[PDB]
């Protein structure tokens, strides 16, 4: 599985959303129904899956699926 696939799987699982709905340009809050808890638990799930830290100032701007994919691809452990 590619990093795109693994990031999308974690997002779908954390947010209770179906894969077909996790499009690359989807907004976590505006398309995938993320509530405030979801935002911190999603960051935590990505950090744990990829063994990487995400600074909160960058999480605040990480508002789409592609933003999360690009962060993870760009910070490989
Ligand atoms: C706990 As699981 C179904 O993402 O391996
Ligand atoms: Na795919
Ligand atoms: Zn899984
Ligand atoms: Zn849905
Ligand atoms: Zn949208
Ligand atoms: Zn951690
Ligand atoms: Zn940890
Ligand atoms: Zn760890
Ligand atoms: Zn951490």
PDB file of N, CA and C and ligand atoms in Angstrom:
ATOM      1  N   UNK A   1       0.870  -1.184   0.000  1.00  0.00           N
ATOM      2  CA  UNK A   1       0.000   0.000   0.000  1.00  0.00           C
ATOM      3  C   UNK A   1       0.899   1.225   0.000  1.00  0.00           C
ATOM      4  N   UNK A   2       0.488   2.180  -0.809  1.00  0.00           N
ATOM      5  CA  UNK A   2       1.228   3.429  -0.922  1.00  0.00           C
ATOM      6  C   UNK A   2       0.927   4.331   0.266  1.00  0.00           C
ATOM      7  N   UNK A   3       1.706   5.392   0.426  1.00  0.00           N
ATOM      8  CA  UNK A   3       1.382   6.339   1.506  1.00  0.00           C
ATOM      9  C   UNK A   3       0.062   6.991   1.226  1.00  0.00           C
ATOM     10  N   UNK A   4      -0.297   7.355   0.020  1.00  0.00           N
ATOM     11  CA  UNK A   4      -1.648   7.873  -0.265  1.00  0.00           C
ATOM     12  C   UNK A   4      -2.720   6.923   0.239  1.00  0.00           C
ATOM     13  N   UNK A   5      -2.586   5.621  -0.103  1.00  0.00           N
ATOM     14  CA  UNK A   5      -3.589   4.653   0.334  1.00  0.00           C
ATOM     15  C   UNK A   5      -3.636   4.543   1.841  1.00  0.00           C
ATOM     16  N   UNK A   6      -2.494   4.530   2.520  1.00  0.00           N
ATOM     17  CA  UNK A   6      -2.489   4.336   3.955  1.00  0.00           C
ATOM     18  C   UNK A   6      -2.999   5.569   4.662  1.00  0.00           C
ATOM     19  N   UNK A   7      -2.666   6.750   4.165  1.00  0.00           N
ATOM     20  CA  UNK A   7      -3.227   7.958   4.792  1.00  0.00           C
ATOM     21  C   UNK A   7      -4.729   7.986   4.611  1.00  0.00           C
ATOM     22  N   UNK A   8      -5.248   7.656   3.419  1.00  0.00           N
ATOM     23  CA  UNK A   8      -6.692   7.675   3.201  1.00  0.00           C
ATOM     24  C   UNK A   8      -7.401   6.622   4.047  1.00  0.00           C
ATOM     25  N   UNK A   9      -6.751   5.459   4.262  1.00  0.00           N
ATOM     26  CA  UNK A   9      -7.357   4.437   5.107  1.00  0.00           C
ATOM     27  C   UNK A   9      -7.472   4.937   6.531  1.00  0.00           C
ATOM     28  N   UNK A  10      -6.414   5.548   7.060  1.00  0.00           N
ATOM     29  CA  UNK A  10      -6.500   6.064   8.438  1.00  0.00           C
ATOM     30  C   UNK A  10      -7.558   7.136   8.561  1.00  0.00           C
ATOM     31  N   UNK A  11      -7.647   8.043   7.594  1.00  0.00           N
ATOM     32  CA  UNK A  11      -8.696   9.067   7.642  1.00  0.00           C
ATOM     33  C   UNK A  11     -10.092   8.473   7.642  1.00  0.00           C
ATOM     34  N   UNK A  12     -10.322   7.510   6.709  1.00  0.00           N
ATOM     35  CA  UNK A  12     -11.651   6.899   6.670  1.00  0.00           C
ATOM     36  C   UNK A  12     -12.025   6.199   7.959  1.00  0.00           C
ATOM     37  N   UNK A  13     -11.079   5.469   8.521  1.00  0.00           N
ATOM     38  CA  UNK A  13     -11.299   4.760   9.774  1.00  0.00           C
ATOM     39  C   UNK A  13     -11.583   5.710  10.918  1.00  0.00           C
ATOM     40  N   UNK A  14     -10.757   6.747  11.085  1.00  0.00           N
ATOM     41  CA  UNK A  14     -10.903   7.705  12.188  1.00  0.00           C
ATOM     42  C   UNK A  14     -12.194   8.478  12.087  1.00  0.00           C
ATOM     43  N   UNK A  15     -12.567   8.884  10.881  1.00  0.00           N
ATOM     44  CA  UNK A  15     -13.746   9.747  10.723  1.00  0.00           C
ATOM     45  C   UNK A  15     -15.013   8.953  10.466  1.00  0.00           C
ATOM     46  N   UNK A  16     -14.942   7.612  10.329  1.00  0.00           N
ATOM     47  CA  UNK A  16     -16.149   6.816  10.033  1.00  0.00           C
ATOM     48  C   UNK A  16     -16.732   7.170   8.676  1.00  0.00           C
ATOM     49  N   UNK A  17     -15.852   7.425   7.699  1.00  0.00           N
ATOM     50  CA  UNK A  17     -16.278   7.788   6.354  1.00  0.00           C
ATOM     51  C   UNK A  17     -15.849   6.705   5.378  1.00  0.00           C
ATOM     52  N   UNK A  18     -16.656   6.507   4.341  1.00  0.00           N
ATOM     53  CA  UNK A  18     -16.362   5.472   3.337  1.00  0.00           C
ATOM     54  C   UNK A  18     -15.257   5.943   2.407  1.00  0.00           C
ATOM     55  N   UNK A  19     -14.443   4.975   1.955  1.00  0.00           N
ATOM     56  CA  UNK A  19     -13.251   5.282   1.155  1.00  0.00           C
ATOM     57  C   UNK A  19     -13.565   6.139  -0.059  1.00  0.00           C
ATOM     58  N   UNK A  20     -14.644   5.827  -0.767  1.00  0.00           N
ATOM     59  CA  UNK A  20     -14.980   6.546  -1.986  1.00  0.00           C
ATOM     60  C   UNK A  20     -15.197   8.025  -1.712  1.00  0.00           C
ATOM     61  N   UNK A  21     -15.518   8.367  -0.445  1.00  0.00           N
ATOM     62  CA  UNK A  21     -15.775   9.751  -0.049  1.00  0.00           C
ATOM     63  C   UNK A  21     -14.478  10.447   0.322  1.00  0.00           C
ATOM     64  N   UNK A  22     -13.418   9.685   0.560  1.00  0.00           N
ATOM     65  CA  UNK A  22     -12.143  10.309   0.942  1.00  0.00           C
ATOM     66  C   UNK A  22     -11.381  10.656  -0.332  1.00  0.00           C
ATOM     67  N   UNK A  23     -11.843  11.723  -0.993  1.00  0.00           N
ATOM     68  CA  UNK A  23     -11.174  12.198  -2.207  1.00  0.00           C
ATOM     69  C   UNK A  23      -9.960  13.010  -1.810  1.00  0.00           C
ATOM     70  N   UNK A  24      -9.020  13.165  -2.707  1.00  0.00           N
ATOM     71  CA  UNK A  24      -7.783  13.854  -2.347  1.00  0.00           C
ATOM     72  C   UNK A  24      -8.006  15.313  -2.004  1.00  0.00           C
ATOM     73  N   UNK A  25      -9.005  15.957  -2.601  1.00  0.00           N
ATOM     74  CA  UNK A  25      -9.239  17.363  -2.324  1.00  0.00           C
ATOM     75  C   UNK A  25     -10.278  17.549  -1.221  1.00  0.00           C
ATOM     76  N   UNK A  26     -10.724  16.478  -0.581  1.00  0.00           N
ATOM     77  CA  UNK A  26     -11.734  16.618   0.468  1.00  0.00           C
ATOM     78  C   UNK A  26     -11.225  17.371   1.701  1.00  0.00           C
ATOM     79  N   UNK A  27     -12.030  18.305   2.188  1.00  0.00           N
ATOM     80  CA  UNK A  27     -11.814  18.941   3.496  1.00  0.00           C
ATOM     81  C   UNK A  27     -12.251  18.039   4.646  1.00  0.00           C
ATOM     82  N   UNK A  28     -11.374  17.901   5.649  1.00  0.00           N
ATOM     83  CA  UNK A  28     -11.766  17.092   6.786  1.00  0.00           C
ATOM     84  C   UNK A  28     -13.043  17.616   7.422  1.00  0.00           C
ATOM     85  N   UNK A  29     -13.070  18.925   7.680  1.00  0.00           N
ATOM     86  CA  UNK A  29     -14.233  19.493   8.346  1.00  0.00           C
ATOM     87  C   UNK A  29     -15.388  19.726   7.385  1.00  0.00           C
ATOM     88  N   UNK A  30     -15.132  20.210   6.170  1.00  0.00           N
ATOM     89  CA  UNK A  30     -16.186  20.664   5.260  1.00  0.00           C
ATOM     90  C   UNK A  30     -16.704  19.570   4.340  1.00  0.00           C
ATOM     91  N   UNK A  31     -16.002  18.448   4.216  1.00  0.00           N
ATOM     92  CA  UNK A  31     -16.507  17.355   3.409  1.00  0.00           C
ATOM     93  C   UNK A  31     -16.643  16.046   4.199  1.00  0.00           C
ATOM     94  N   UNK A  32     -15.707  15.795   5.127  1.00  0.00           N
ATOM     95  CA  UNK A  32     -15.660  14.497   5.783  1.00  0.00           C
ATOM     96  C   UNK A  32     -16.210  14.543   7.196  1.00  0.00           C
ATOM     97  N   UNK A  33     -16.947  15.607   7.588  1.00  0.00           N
ATOM     98  CA  UNK A  33     -17.712  15.655   8.811  1.00  0.00           C
ATOM     99  C   UNK A  33     -16.875  15.669  10.071  1.00  0.00           C
ATOM    100  N   UNK A  34     -15.594  16.025  10.013  1.00  0.00           N
ATOM    101  CA  UNK A  34     -14.775  15.969  11.211  1.00  0.00           C
ATOM    102  C   UNK A  34     -15.243  17.001  12.241  1.00  0.00           C
ATOM    103  N   UNK A  35     -15.370  16.492  13.460  1.00  0.00           N
ATOM    104  CA  UNK A  35     -15.736  17.388  14.569  1.00  0.00           C
ATOM    105  C   UNK A  35     -14.468  17.740  15.349  1.00  0.00           C
ATOM    106  N   UNK A  36     -14.571  18.482  16.445  1.00  0.00           N
ATOM    107  CA  UNK A  36     -13.329  18.973  17.035  1.00  0.00           C
ATOM    108  C   UNK A  36     -12.508  17.830  17.621  1.00  0.00           C
ATOM    109  N   UNK A  37     -13.115  16.850  18.263  1.00  0.00           N
ATOM    110  CA  UNK A  37     -12.318  15.723  18.739  1.00  0.00           C
ATOM    111  C   UNK A  37     -11.592  15.047  17.584  1.00  0.00           C
ATOM    112  N   UNK A  38     -12.300  14.898  16.470  1.00  0.00           N
ATOM    113  CA  UNK A  38     -11.782  14.166  15.320  1.00  0.00           C
ATOM    114  C   UNK A  38     -10.469  14.798  14.865  1.00  0.00           C
ATOM    115  N   UNK A  39     -10.425  16.130  14.927  1.00  0.00           N
ATOM    116  CA  UNK A  39      -9.205  16.741  14.397  1.00  0.00           C
ATOM    117  C   UNK A  39      -7.995  16.272  15.203  1.00  0.00           C
ATOM    118  N   UNK A  40      -8.076  16.248  16.534  1.00  0.00           N
ATOM    119  CA  UNK A  40      -6.893  15.841  17.308  1.00  0.00           C
ATOM    120  C   UNK A  40      -6.697  14.339  17.203  1.00  0.00           C
ATOM    121  N   UNK A  41      -7.754  13.540  17.139  1.00  0.00           N
ATOM    122  CA  UNK A  41      -7.536  12.100  17.041  1.00  0.00           C
ATOM    123  C   UNK A  41      -6.990  11.723  15.675  1.00  0.00           C
ATOM    124  N   UNK A  42      -7.344  12.432  14.623  1.00  0.00           N
ATOM    125  CA  UNK A  42      -6.780  12.146  13.311  1.00  0.00           C
ATOM    126  C   UNK A  42      -5.294  12.418  13.272  1.00  0.00           C
ATOM    127  N   UNK A  43      -4.900  13.578  13.819  1.00  0.00           N
ATOM    128  CA  UNK A  43      -3.458  13.870  13.917  1.00  0.00           C
ATOM    129  C   UNK A  43      -2.740  12.764  14.683  1.00  0.00           C
ATOM    130  N   UNK A  44      -3.311  12.366  15.817  1.00  0.00           N
ATOM    131  CA  UNK A  44      -2.691  11.299  16.618  1.00  0.00           C
ATOM    132  C   UNK A  44      -2.556  10.004  15.845  1.00  0.00           C
ATOM    133  N   UNK A  45      -3.608   9.618  15.087  1.00  0.00           N
ATOM    134  CA  UNK A  45      -3.582   8.380  14.320  1.00  0.00           C
ATOM    135  C   UNK A  45      -2.514   8.426  13.232  1.00  0.00           C
ATOM    136  N   UNK A  46      -2.380   9.555  12.562  1.00  0.00           N
ATOM    137  CA  UNK A  46      -1.364   9.685  11.511  1.00  0.00           C
ATOM    138  C   UNK A  46       0.001   9.613  12.164  1.00  0.00           C
ATOM    139  N   UNK A  47       0.183  10.315  13.300  1.00  0.00           N
ATOM    140  CA  UNK A  47       1.505  10.313  13.956  1.00  0.00           C
ATOM    141  C   UNK A  47       1.930   8.890  14.324  1.00  0.00           C
ATOM    142  N   UNK A  48       0.988   8.125  14.854  1.00  0.00           N
ATOM    143  CA  UNK A  48       1.264   6.773  15.284  1.00  0.00           C
ATOM    144  C   UNK A  48       1.465   5.859  14.076  1.00  0.00           C
ATOM    145  N   UNK A  49       0.707   6.014  12.989  1.00  0.00           N
ATOM    146  CA  UNK A  49       0.853   5.104  11.856  1.00  0.00           C
ATOM    147  C   UNK A  49       2.205   5.294  11.175  1.00  0.00           C
ATOM    148  N   UNK A  50       2.700   6.535  11.146  1.00  0.00           N
ATOM    149  CA  UNK A  50       3.877   6.875  10.343  1.00  0.00           C
ATOM    150  C   UNK A  50       5.076   7.241  11.178  1.00  0.00           C
ATOM    151  N   UNK A  51       4.989   7.104  12.488  1.00  0.00           N
ATOM    152  CA  UNK A  51       6.018   7.397  13.461  1.00  0.00           C
ATOM    153  C   UNK A  51       6.622   8.770  13.213  1.00  0.00           C
ATOM    154  N   UNK A  52       5.734   9.757  13.123  1.00  0.00           N
ATOM    155  CA  UNK A  52       6.217  11.102  12.888  1.00  0.00           C
ATOM    156  C   UNK A  52       5.439  12.099  13.736  1.00  0.00           C
ATOM    157  N   UNK A  53       6.053  13.195  14.084  1.00  0.00           N
ATOM    158  CA  UNK A  53       5.333  14.253  14.818  1.00  0.00           C
ATOM    159  C   UNK A  53       4.750  15.224  13.816  1.00  0.00           C
ATOM    160  N   UNK A  54       3.595  15.778  14.124  1.00  0.00           N
ATOM    161  CA  UNK A  54       3.015  16.855  13.338  1.00  0.00           C
ATOM    162  C   UNK A  54       2.865  18.032  14.293  1.00  0.00           C
ATOM    163  N   UNK A  55       3.640  19.103  14.156  1.00  0.00           N
ATOM    164  CA  UNK A  55       3.478  20.286  14.984  1.00  0.00           C
ATOM    165  C   UNK A  55       2.067  20.821  14.899  1.00  0.00           C
ATOM    166  N   UNK A  56       1.500  21.273  16.028  1.00  0.00           N
ATOM    167  CA  UNK A  56       0.099  21.740  15.942  1.00  0.00           C
ATOM    168  C   UNK A  56      -0.073  22.925  14.986  1.00  0.00           C
ATOM    169  N   UNK A  57       0.900  23.813  14.802  1.00  0.00           N
ATOM    170  CA  UNK A  57       0.709  24.983  13.937  1.00  0.00           C
ATOM    171  C   UNK A  57       0.557  24.488  12.492  1.00  0.00           C
ATOM    172  N   UNK A  58       1.216  23.362  12.184  1.00  0.00           N
ATOM    173  CA  UNK A  58       0.974  22.760  10.869  1.00  0.00           C
ATOM    174  C   UNK A  58      -0.284  21.942  10.772  1.00  0.00           C
ATOM    175  N   UNK A  59      -0.651  21.247  11.847  1.00  0.00           N
ATOM    176  CA  UNK A  59      -1.961  20.605  11.788  1.00  0.00           C
ATOM    177  C   UNK A  59      -3.075  21.609  11.539  1.00  0.00           C
ATOM    178  N   UNK A  60      -3.037  22.810  12.054  1.00  0.00           N
ATOM    179  CA  UNK A  60      -4.086  23.815  11.936  1.00  0.00           C
ATOM    180  C   UNK A  60      -4.360  24.155  10.482  1.00  0.00           C
ATOM    181  N   UNK A  61      -3.322  24.049   9.660  1.00  0.00           N
ATOM    182  CA  UNK A  61      -3.417  24.333   8.236  1.00  0.00           C
ATOM    183  C   UNK A  61      -3.605  23.100   7.377  1.00  0.00           C
ATOM    184  N   UNK A  62      -3.680  21.924   8.017  1.00  0.00           N
ATOM    185  CA  UNK A  62      -3.698  20.629   7.293  1.00  0.00           C
ATOM    186  C   UNK A  62      -5.151  20.234   7.079  1.00  0.00           C
ATOM    187  N   UNK A  63      -5.846  20.965   6.195  1.00  0.00           N
ATOM    188  CA  UNK A  63      -7.295  20.941   6.275  1.00  0.00           C
ATOM    189  C   UNK A  63      -7.885  19.995   5.232  1.00  0.00           C
ATOM    190  N   UNK A  64      -7.083  19.425   4.346  1.00  0.00           N
ATOM    191  CA  UNK A  64      -7.558  18.540   3.293  1.00  0.00           C
ATOM    192  C   UNK A  64      -6.774  17.244   3.330  1.00  0.00           C
ATOM    193  N   UNK A  65      -7.385  16.232   2.708  1.00  0.00           N
ATOM    194  CA  UNK A  65      -6.743  14.941   2.568  1.00  0.00           C
ATOM    195  C   UNK A  65      -5.375  15.094   1.906  1.00  0.00           C
ATOM    196  N   UNK A  66      -5.291  15.864   0.792  1.00  0.00           N
ATOM    197  CA  UNK A  66      -4.001  16.016   0.137  1.00  0.00           C
ATOM    198  C   UNK A  66      -2.950  16.665   1.014  1.00  0.00           C
ATOM    199  N   UNK A  67      -3.321  17.623   1.859  1.00  0.00           N
ATOM    200  CA  UNK A  67      -2.409  18.220   2.781  1.00  0.00           C
ATOM    201  C   UNK A  67      -1.811  17.148   3.706  1.00  0.00           C
ATOM    202  N   UNK A  68      -2.628  16.221   4.191  1.00  0.00           N
ATOM    203  CA  UNK A  68      -2.106  15.173   5.072  1.00  0.00           C
ATOM    204  C   UNK A  68      -1.215  14.207   4.323  1.00  0.00           C
ATOM    205  N   UNK A  69      -1.618  13.832   3.128  1.00  0.00           N
ATOM    206  CA  UNK A  69      -0.750  12.968   2.295  1.00  0.00           C
ATOM    207  C   UNK A  69       0.592  13.620   2.048  1.00  0.00           C
ATOM    208  N   UNK A  70       0.553  14.906   1.666  1.00  0.00           N
ATOM    209  CA  UNK A  70       1.812  15.589   1.353  1.00  0.00           C
ATOM    210  C   UNK A  70       2.695  15.726   2.584  1.00  0.00           C
ATOM    211  N   UNK A  71       2.118  15.982   3.748  1.00  0.00           N
ATOM    212  CA  UNK A  71       2.928  16.075   4.951  1.00  0.00           C
ATOM    213  C   UNK A  71       3.594  14.705   5.137  1.00  0.00           C
ATOM    214  N   UNK A  72       2.833  13.621   5.161  1.00  0.00           N
ATOM    215  CA  UNK A  72       3.402  12.321   5.507  1.00  0.00           C
ATOM    216  C   UNK A  72       4.463  11.946   4.480  1.00  0.00           C
ATOM    217  N   UNK A  73       4.151  12.146   3.177  1.00  0.00           N
ATOM    218  CA  UNK A  73       5.158  11.818   2.154  1.00  0.00           C
ATOM    219  C   UNK A  73       6.437  12.612   2.337  1.00  0.00           C
ATOM    220  N   UNK A  74       6.293  13.833   2.811  1.00  0.00           N
ATOM    221  CA  UNK A  74       7.393  14.765   2.929  1.00  0.00           C
ATOM    222  C   UNK A  74       8.202  14.611   4.183  1.00  0.00           C
ATOM    223  N   UNK A  75       7.794  13.760   5.138  1.00  0.00           N
ATOM    224  CA  UNK A  75       8.476  13.624   6.433  1.00  0.00           C
ATOM    225  C   UNK A  75       8.733  12.149   6.732  1.00  0.00           C
ATOM    226  N   UNK A  76       9.223  11.404   5.740  1.00  0.00           N
ATOM    227  CA  UNK A  76       9.340   9.957   5.991  1.00  0.00           C
ATOM    228  C   UNK A  76      10.323   9.524   7.066  1.00  0.00           C
ATOM    229  N   UNK A  77       9.815   8.611   7.884  1.00  0.00           N
ATOM    230  CA  UNK A  77      10.482   7.873   8.934  1.00  0.00           C
ATOM    231  C   UNK A  77      10.880   6.479   8.441  1.00  0.00           C
TER     232      UNK A  77
HETATM  233  C1  LIG B   1      -7.086  -2.025  13.933  1.00  0.00           C
HETATM  234 AS1  LIG B   1      -6.884  -1.956  11.967  1.00  0.00          AS
HETATM  235  C2  LIG B   1      -8.539  -2.888  11.299  1.00  0.00           C
HETATM  236  O1  LIG B   1      -6.625  -0.526  11.014  1.00  0.00           O
HETATM  237  O2  LIG B   1      -5.499  -2.924  11.447  1.00  0.00           O
HETATM  238 NA1  LIG B   2      -6.229   4.492  -4.563  1.00  0.00          NA
HETATM  239 ZN1  LIG B   3      -7.032  -0.148   9.278  1.00  0.00          ZN
HETATM  240 ZN1  LIG B   4     -20.091   9.534   4.462  1.00  0.00          ZN
HETATM  241 ZN1  LIG B   5     -14.705  20.419  -0.243  1.00  0.00          ZN
HETATM  242 ZN1  LIG B   6       2.567  10.304  19.336  1.00  0.00          ZN
HETATM  243 ZN1  LIG B   7       3.025   7.293  20.218  1.00  0.00          ZN
HETATM  244 ZN1  LIG B   8       5.463   5.830  18.691  1.00  0.00          ZN
HETATM  245 ZN1  LIG B   9       3.143  13.402  18.815  1.00  0.00          ZN
END
